[PDB]
Structure formats: structure tokens, C-alpha cells
Amino acid sequence: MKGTFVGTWIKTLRDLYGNDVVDESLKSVGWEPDRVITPLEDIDDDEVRRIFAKVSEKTGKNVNEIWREVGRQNIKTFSEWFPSYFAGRRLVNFLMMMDEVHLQLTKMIKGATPPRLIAKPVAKDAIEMEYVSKRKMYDYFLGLIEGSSKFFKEEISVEEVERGEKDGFSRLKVRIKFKNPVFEY
């Protein structure tokens, strides 16, 4: 994973659980709590897992709940960094462009493997969106959806339809219902 994003995650963990909890967890992995994450570096997926596992241990919070909350908070951060994706858009449009955004933002990186986030209309007031990734970040995905709803101040209902692994990929399909219509033309 990329550095300052994970850096973002770590910052969020500090806000939720305190500096003490986070410092120790970073220390348990061989980091200095005040280690600088450079603007370019990349941090391994498996060290992230270990960090989150330790924060879970020390807070008693299940790691899936922690990921969900990190996802909910992360949307705000992405609005600081990529304001154009948020400006002048409604929630439905925002969610519908996510698959492309993740391709566009990683296409320059050798060996990149972004999540796929394909969405399509399934009713006049609803989309189905499918998470597809080797990383199995199901709760982060769901949390990001919830955080988007909060950020845009547009209420939604989210129903999980399918979950599981296939072809070496994790997949999670949800149906998202918007409060008033969005696919009538």
C-alpha cells in the first residue's frame, strides 16, 4: 500500500483510539511512532494488517469494526486531496465514477492492482456496486460508502447481496437505494 494513505489510516487510528494505543502498535512492528512516511514510499499490505491487529488487541475492538470506522472517516481526507471529485456532484454520480477514479489514479504505477468498484443502475432509485480485490477489505469498502453518504448529506440504504472469494479475488456486491429517484430521464 502507498505511504501517506496508510499514514492517513494511522492518523485516523490516533483520533479514534489515542496516541498511546497507536505508538505501541507501531512499536510492536518495529516502527518508530515518529517515523516519517515520505511522500513517495510504499508500505507493505501485511505490515498494515499487523498494525491493525495490534490496535484491535489493545482496544478490544474487532478489527472489522475498526476498518469500517477508518473507511467512514477517510472520505473527508480524500476531499482535502481531491476536491474536484466532490465539487458540483451528487452522491450517485460520485459513486458511479469510483471505478474509473481508482483506475486513473493508479495507471502510472508499475504492477498496480486497484480495487474494482463497478456500479450500475438496477432500479430507478438504486445501484448495485461490486467490490472486487485480492485485498479483502470488505469493511473498509462498506465504511467508505457510509462516509460518502454522510459527506454529501444524502441518505441511503445499503443491502449486502453477495460476499465471497472467487478466482483468487474477494468480492462484495451491495445494493444502494437513494431516497428520491436518480435514473429517470
Ligand code: HEM
Ligand atoms: C475521492 C475519493 C477516493 C479516492 C481519490 C480514492 C482513491 C483510492 C486509491 C488511489 C486507492 C489505492 C489503490 C491501490 O493502491 O491499489 C484506494 C484504495 C481503496 N479504495 Fe478508494 N478512493 C476514493 C473513494 C473510495 C470509495 C467511495 C470507495 C468505495 C465505494 C473506495 C474503495 C476503496 C477500497 C476498498 C480500497 C482498498 C484497496 C483494496 O481494497 O484493494 N474508495 N482508493
